[PDB]
Design a protein around this ligand. Sequence first.
Ligand SMILES: [Mg+2]
Ligand SMILES: [Mg+2]
Lengths: 225, 214
Amino acid sequence: GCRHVAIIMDGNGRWAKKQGKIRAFGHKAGAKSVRRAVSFAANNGIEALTLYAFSSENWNRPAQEVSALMELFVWALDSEVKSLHRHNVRLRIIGDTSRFNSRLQERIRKSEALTAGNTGLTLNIAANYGGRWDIVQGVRQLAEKVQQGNLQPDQIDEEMLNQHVCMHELAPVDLVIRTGGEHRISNFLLWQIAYAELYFTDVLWPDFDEQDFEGALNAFANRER
Amino acid sequence: LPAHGCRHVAIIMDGNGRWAKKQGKIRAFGHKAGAKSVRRAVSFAANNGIEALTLYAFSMELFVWALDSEVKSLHRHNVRLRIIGDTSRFNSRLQERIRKSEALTAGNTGLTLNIAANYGGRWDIVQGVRQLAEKVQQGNLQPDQIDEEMLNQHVCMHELAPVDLVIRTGGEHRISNFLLWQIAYAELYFTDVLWPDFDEQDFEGALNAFANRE
Ligand SMILES: [Mg+2]
Ligand SMILES: [Mg+2]
C-alpha cells in the first residue's frame, strides 16, 4: 500500500573512505545505488520515488569546478534518460532550477518533456530544493492572486496551499527513508510528509539494497494509524 | 546554554489508551496517568535548563480541567504558559480562561511551556500565510518580498529557540501533522515506551540522542 517513497541518500563519502578510496569512488557507487533503488521501486508498484539530490546551498568549489560539474549533469541526462523513457519512467526535477546555467535548465526541460507522457514510475529528483522554499513558492503564487483581487485572505486553506506545493498531483508521500544514520529531515520535503512513516537506517547509501528497501516498506506496512 | 545543548523539546505523547488497556482500565485512567507524566516531564525540563517544551495536546474536558487547577502550580514554578493552535473555536469561557492563564504567567522567566490544542502543522503554516495575505491586501506587502525568513516570522513560536528535538512515544514513526515548518532541522526521537511510563531516564536518553547528532 506504499505509493510514494522519498529518500535522503547520505553516506557516499564515508563509504568511500571506509574502503580506502577517494570520494569520487563513493559517488560512482552511490549512482549505482540510485539505479538499483529506481528499478526496485518500479518493479514493485511504487508510483513515485523522490530523491534528494541537493539543497540550494552553495558548493565549496571553484567556479570552473562548478561549471564542469553542471556539464557532467548535462552528460548524465543525455546518456541515461532514453533508457528511463523506454522503461516508461516520468522524470521530473523539483526545486529552484533557475539557479542552474541556461544549458542545464534547457536539458532538464527536454528530459522532462520527453518523458512527461509516461505512465510508469514518476521519478522526482529534488535539486536546489528545500522544503521551506517549496512552501514559500506556493505562498508567493497565492499572494499574487490576492494582490490581483482574485483571492480573499480568508479563502486560503490547507487544500488551496496544497495545490501550490510540489508534487500535489501525485500520491501523498507515504514513507521517507534516510540512510547514513542521522535522524532528521534536514528541510527535505516538509509539507508533504505530515503523515509519512519516517525510516532511519545506519546503512550508508552505496550499500542500501533491495533487502534494505524492503525493510523500510515493512516498517510502513506495520504502521498503526 | 546547559551542557546538553538542547533548548527546545517538543513531544507527541501517545500511548495513554494502550497503557490503560494493558491493565484492564478505561482510557480515562490512562489519560490521568498521562497527565502525571506531563508534570514529571515539565519538572525535568525546568530543572535541566530547557528553554521551551511543546506538548501536542490534541489536533476537551481534561484540557479545561488542567487550566483550572494546574496554572497555579505552573506559576509557582516560574513557568511561562502558552497555548498554540486554533482557539477561536473554543467556547468563549475557555478562551477567557486561556487568556487569563497566559497573562498571569507571561512574565515568568523559567521554562516556556507550549500546549498545542486544536493544533495542526499545516494549519499553523496556513494561518501565517493568511497573515501575509492580509498584509498584501492592505497594501503593506508585495508578493515577491515574501521569503522563508518572513514566513518563519509568522508561524507559531517563531520568537522562541528553534525546536531541537521531537520525541514521540507509543511506537509510531511519524509527525502526524504536529509541528512541520518548525522541525526542518530537529533531531527526531521515537520510542516504543507508552507515554504514562516515560520517565526521567527516558527524557535523559532523548537528550543524549540529541547530543550525539552529527
Ligand atoms: Mg540521531
Ligand atoms: Mg513504524
